[PDB]
């Protein structure tokens, strides 16, 4: 539904705006990217990795398991 003007209730707040051509496209671009970048990423890493760890452990692992299992022996 939405659109606007039936939208919702906002009392006693305020804003500030600026025209686009004003700013610079990349303030502190490299600078700001930063352990800011590592802040998101690095922040997430621990949460991320373990499954992938198990993976490499796996395709590696079983890769060995069956791979060796393809070898022939004596007698």
């Amino acid at each position: 539904g939405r659109q606007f003007g039936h939208l919702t209730r906002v009392r006693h707040v305020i804003t500030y705006s600026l025209s686009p051509f004003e700013q610079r496209a990349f303030p502190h671009y490299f600078s700001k990217g930063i352990p800011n970048v590592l802040r998101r990423t690095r922040a997430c890493i621990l949460r991320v990795a373990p499954p992938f760890v198990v993976f490499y452990l796996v395709y590696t692992w079983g890769t060995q398991e069956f791979e060796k299992s393809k070898r022939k022996n004596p007698a």
């Binding site: 606007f4 003007g5 039936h6 209730r9 906002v10 009392r11 006693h12 707040v13 305020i14 804003t15 500030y16 705006s17 600026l18 025209s19 004003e22």
Partner: protein, 112 residues
């Protein structure tokens, strides 16, 4: 005399918008403006005339069916706003001259 009499170093005024964000504002007292007179520039002469072409659409004004500012006209036909008044904001050589306005949840868009 003695000291401290500098001149006006040009720059940019704010260039923004802010809503004092009010559910409590019962109906828009809206507005707008585009250069209003100030002291200096030779241009504003016709800009005056231009602002004339602009004009101020008065709520208390009647006659919208016949209104001169085409804006004003549709504003009547569409019942498209509750006010607009060309209002000239002044600084030597620059400013904003343009409509006050009043409106509900709607107008502003088509207004511009």
């Amino acid at each position: 005399d003695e000291d401290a009499v500098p001149t006006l170093t040009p720059c940019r005024f704010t260039g923004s918008e802010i809503r004092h964000r009010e559910d409590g504002l019962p109906l828009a007292h809206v507005a707008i403006a585009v250069e209003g007179p100030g002291w200096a520039n030779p241009d504003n002469v016709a800009l005056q005339v231009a602002n004339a072409i602009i004009g101020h659409y008065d709520c208390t004004y009647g006659g919208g069916m016949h209104l001169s500012s085409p804006l004003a006209s549709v504003a009547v036909t569409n019942k498209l706003c509750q006010s607009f008044q060309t209002f000239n904001i002044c600084y030597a050589d620059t400013g904003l001259l343009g409509a006050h306005f009043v409106c509900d949840h709607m107008s502003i868009d088509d207004m511009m």
